[PDB]
RNA sequence: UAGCUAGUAGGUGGGGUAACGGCUCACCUAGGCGACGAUCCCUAGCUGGUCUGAGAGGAUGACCAGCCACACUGGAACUGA
RNA sequence: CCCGCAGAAGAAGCACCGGCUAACUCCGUGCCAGCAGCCGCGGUAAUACGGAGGGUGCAAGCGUUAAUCGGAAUUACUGGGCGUAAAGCGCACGCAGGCGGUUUGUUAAGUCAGAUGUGAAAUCCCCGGGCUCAACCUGGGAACUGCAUCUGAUACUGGCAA
């Protein structure tokens, strides 16, 4: 089962999630097929916090792919006007 | 004005019937700082007369060196008595990166950015003759276009 | 030379042999130090060099120089052994670390106190 | 036993400029004429001409600008025991660009400067300093 | 870290004045300058070719008050940065925050102006910065906080600082106690005395 | 289009099999000389249509035995 | 360390495997590998990389990440995608 | 993280100082005690041993040992040598191997150019961004000198034919 989930990179107390497309059996920072963006939760109110290549994400859900609760939340958070 | 620079002072012997009688040899290089350089050997019984005899020999043995903006024209080699000396133009190499007795001859010629390396024997007398054989064999683009191509825009490109 | 010869037999890298064969990739070695004694140096030098035989914990039995002035090594002194030859005694390639296990530091040192294992003169 | 005719041609130029000879002679070939045409067009030699029909012989009149010669140094790079082929971004420059390197490329025999501008490389034949 | 010692013995070992003191007078002539850096001070040495490269690097390192691990990282970032690495090493040393506040006149010495910027007193671009080695970019404005403004020391260094050559790569108002770093100082503006190529030659040894 | 290689027959006496050596012209990694190397393969033929010492063109197929993964394509420059 | 190999090398046929195949079995052919280093012995997880060096190289494979192998020692299958 | 209180208050060592190698004098000891990475110091006026004062180096570290590379062009592809320093087989013949005069045609293997797929991410490098800066984290690019296929180029090398 291919999953689109967050691989936690970055330093201690400064997380940086890479929105990545990996098999469910692999580890969190382990193997993947593709990375399709990133997510910076500590990027507070400055210029840029998150970026997801939604065309490649919509390509993988067409092949059949579950998405995590955060990845489903960031896809919602890039709104119709925002 | 002429940048006198002593490289090394040695102590040589002669071995007479009484004992060994010593004398001193110097090695000084002079040069204005815009492409003229000369070395003189000199030897005498005491130290300051051996250095002063080197200064008079070095002034009457200067040569002409062509340099582009305080650096060399091309990578050039120099060989004298088991001393193989390599030198690069080092386009803003920012410093005379050269060894003992190869750095001193390059300071008084006026050249400032060289990557130089001495192979073989690094005897201080022979490496000064190796660099000077390397510098006067080096030719400028004006001298090469004077004998080949007949245009400095066509020789370089 | 003659590059077709180097294809049939490449240039063999010369192997560098270690000078402290008793402590392999080991910075220090610990021994049991049987027979502390003294010897005389080689020619142009003359002293009574304080040295010790020592059987290390890997099984090697080597001879080690006791640096500094005065020691307390008595035949079953478990000591620490570091590298460094003497250039004056035939066969000694090692130094005893003073102030490590049993070989205590040198009395009345004021200069180079980290060597020879001497603490700070507080009071 | 005469396995590099190209290095023998450069050796005659090297020994001819050392002996201060007016001209040098060698048995001609198609590659010897073409690289001597490169040597004439750059300015290292002048007025080469072949003489012969069944046993052709090539003449090279050597140049002397001052009492010193013009060909300061000449090496043979791609030996028969070791052939050297260079790419477009890998063509060398002799004496920081004020020498030439004769390259045999797929569009003919040219210099290192004329082959970099053509955008293609090949067997570097010699370094004429 | 820092020196925390007699800051005229360092100037006597180099010979020249390093501006390590405030200088209400001139040469203090209370220190025996150009005569003796120690007990064997009249005994001047041969000062070999490695030693002349060491003295020039230790001269520049004693002006700004940096240490060797911090100085070697300045050379290492100057060598990879594009351009002349001789003046790139001096553009980074003059880009320090404790040096810029000295050249704006708010500190009488380098060590005094370091103690202002270390004691949470001096802000850059409206934000409080605490360290000495902060690399200031061009067109950055450095201000003085109002809790340590009106400090019986900062304006006292300002009427001393009209004789400090007016460094014309940064404009200082000194009435409101603000100033901007206009551009990086070129090699033609730094004291005409230091031989930076001896420092580049010493680290290539 | 099929990837295929040339090569000469070394031996044939093995009952519907032949062995084929392929000479590739590789450059040395260190010394830069060009060295002839050899790629002796066990290739498959049907009815023994190949003697000793002739060029045989081969292409890769499914494994047919232990070290037999190549079949014949054609024969050019037949041995005399 | 100069020869090594009889299921060994190949064919045919039956059987097995999720699948090709001496994978296995029977019968025929007498081959197969090897001085471009087989065989045997010593050592060793491999790589992306790391360290060094002007580079070419040399040394190395801790951390992080990819692959492999192992799970008291040795052997075995079951269940199950 | 910010703010407030108090008080220079709680906070500097370690190696070295004969040449290499930056930094020197005095006293003790007298081939002794000892030092030493290499040259080597010590035989009564030791800048080399031990102590003192001074100085130099680096700094919350500093030295020592261990290991690797560099210096070492001292295994040399880049980039070495063989008359006498180490080094031409005693001298031939000859198989595999390596290399090969000259002209033309052909082939496109070597070679070269272009394109495509791939060469995981991190790392390295470049320009930026975020941590008070920095280390650290991170966006994008470059790089991954490769291999494979396809399409051309035909000078040189190779094959083939004369």
UniProtKB/Swiss-Prot annotation, chain A:
Top-rank taxon: Bacteria
Gene induction: Part of the rpsP-rimM-trmD-rplS operon.
PROSITE patterns documented for this protein: RIBOSOMAL_S16
A cellular component annotation (GO) from this entry: cytosolic small ribosomal subunit
Keywords: Endonuclease, Hydrolase, Nuclease, Ribonucleoprotein, Ribosomal protein
Stored Gene3D superfamilies: 3.30.1320.10
Record bears the keyword Ribosomal protein: yes
InterPro entries found in the cross-reference section: Ribosomal_bS16 (IPR000307), Ribosomal_bS16_CS (IPR020592), Ribosomal_bS16_dom_sf (IPR023803)
One BP term from GO: cytoplasmic translation
GO molecular function, one term: four-way junction DNA binding
Subunit structure: Part of the 30S ribosomal subunit.
Task performed by this protein: In addition to being a ribosomal protein, S16 also has a cation-dependent endonuclease activity. In-frame fusions with the ribosome maturation factor rimM suppress mutations in the latter (probably due to increased rimM expression) and are found in translationally active 70S ribosomes.
Family note: Belongs to the bacterial ribosomal protein bS16 family.
Protein name per Swiss-Prot or TrEMBL: Small ribosomal subunit protein bS16
Species the sequence originates in: Escherichia coli (strain K12)
Gene giving rise to this polypeptide: rpsP
UniProtKB/Swiss-Prot annotation, chain B:
InterPro entries: Ribosomal_Su5_D2-typ_SF, Ribosomal_uS5, Ribosomal_uS5_bac-type, Ribosomal_uS5_C, Ribosomal_uS5_N, Ribosomal_uS5_N_CS, Ribsml_uS5_D2-typ_fold_subgr
Effect of residue 13 to P: In strain: SPCR13 and SPCR15; spectinomycin resistant. Not a ram mutation
Statement: the UniProt record of this protein carries the keyword Transmembrane: no
Cysteines joined through disulfide linkages: none
Pfam family, one: Ribosomal_S5_C
Domain S5 DRBM: 2-65
Record GO biological process: cytoplasmic translation; maintenance of translational fidelity; response to antibiotic; ribosomal small subunit assembly; translation
Keyword entries, A-Z: Acetylation, Antibiotic resistance, Ribonucleoprotein, Ribosomal protein, RNA-binding, rRNA-binding
Keyword Acetylation recorded: yes
GO cellular component: cytoplasm; cytosol; cytosolic small ribosomal subunit
Source organism superkingdom: Bacteria
TM segment ranges: none
GO MF term list: rRNA binding; structural constituent of ribosome
PROSITE patterns (UniProt xref): RIBOSOMAL_S5, S5_DSRBD
UniProt note: domains: The N-terminal domain interacts with the head of the 30S subunit; the C-terminal domain interacts with the body and contacts protein uS4. The interaction surface between uS4 and uS5 is involved in control of translational fidelity.
Note: Altered uS5 proteins have been identified in a number of mutants. Some mutations in uS5 have been shown to increase translational error frequencies. Some mutants in this protein can partially suppress an alanyl-tRNA synthetase mutant.
Xref: PANTHER family: MITOCHONDRIAL RIBOSOMAL PROTEIN S5 (PTHR48277:SF1)
Stated family: Belongs to the universal ribosomal protein uS5 family.
Name of the protein described by the UniProt record: Small ribosomal subunit protein uS5
Organism: Escherichia coli (strain K12)
Swiss-Prot record, chain C:
Outcome after substituting residue 56 to H: Protein is not incorporated into ribosomes
Reported impact of residue 87 to Q: Confers low-level resistance to streptomycin and a 15% decrease in the translational elongation rate
Residue spans crossing the bilayer: none
A UniProt-annotated Pfam family: Ribosom_S12_S23
PROSITE patterns assigned to the protein according to its UniProt record, in alphabetical order: RIBOSOMAL_S12 (PS00055)
Record PTM 3-methylthioaspartic acid, positions in chain: 88
Biological process terms in GO annotation: cytoplasmic translation; Group I intron splicing; maintenance of translational fidelity; positive regulation of RNA splicing; response to antibiotic; RNA folding; translation
Residues carrying N6-acetyllysine: 107
Keyword entries, A-Z: Acetylation, Antibiotic resistance, Methylation, Ribonucleoprotein, Ribosomal protein, RNA-binding, rRNA-binding, tRNA-binding
GO annotations of cellular component type: cytoplasm; cytosol; cytosolic small ribosomal subunit; ribosome
Top-level taxon: Bacteria
Keyword Transmembrane helix in annotation: no
Function: With S4 and S5 plays an important role in translational accuracy.
Family, as annotated: Belongs to the universal ribosomal protein uS12 family.
Note: At least 19 substitutions or deletions in 11 codons can promote streptomycin resistance, dependence or pseudodependence; all but one of the streptomycin resistant mutations (K42R) are associated with hyperaccurate translation and thus reduced translational efficiency.
NCBIfam families in UniProt: rpsL_bact
Protein name (record): Small ribosomal subunit protein uS12
Organism: Escherichia coli (strain K12)
Curated annotation (Swiss-Prot), chain E:
Subunit annotation: Part of the 30S ribosomal subunit. Contacts protein S5. With proteins S3 and S5 encircles the mRNA as it enters the ribosome, which may play a role in mRNA helicase processivity. Some nascent polypeptide chains are able to cross-link to this protein in situ. The rRNA transcription and antitermination complex (rrnTAC) consists of RNAP, NusA, NusB, NusE (rpsJ), NusG, SubB, ribosomal protein S4, DNA and precursor rRNA; S4 is more flexible than other subunits.
One annotated GO biological process: response to antibiotic
Keyword Repeat attributed: no
Protein name: Small ribosomal subunit protein uS4
GO cellular component: a single term: cytosol
Function in brief: One of two assembly initiator proteins for the 30S subunit, it binds directly to 16S rRNA where it nucleates assembly of the body of the 30S subunit. With S5 and S12 plays an important role in translational accuracy; many suppressors of streptomycin-dependent mutants of protein S12 are found in this protein, some but not all of which decrease translational accuracy (ram, ribosomal ambiguity mutations).
Family: Belongs to the universal ribosomal protein uS4 family.
Residue ranges annotated for the S4 RNA-binding domain, each copy included: 95-155
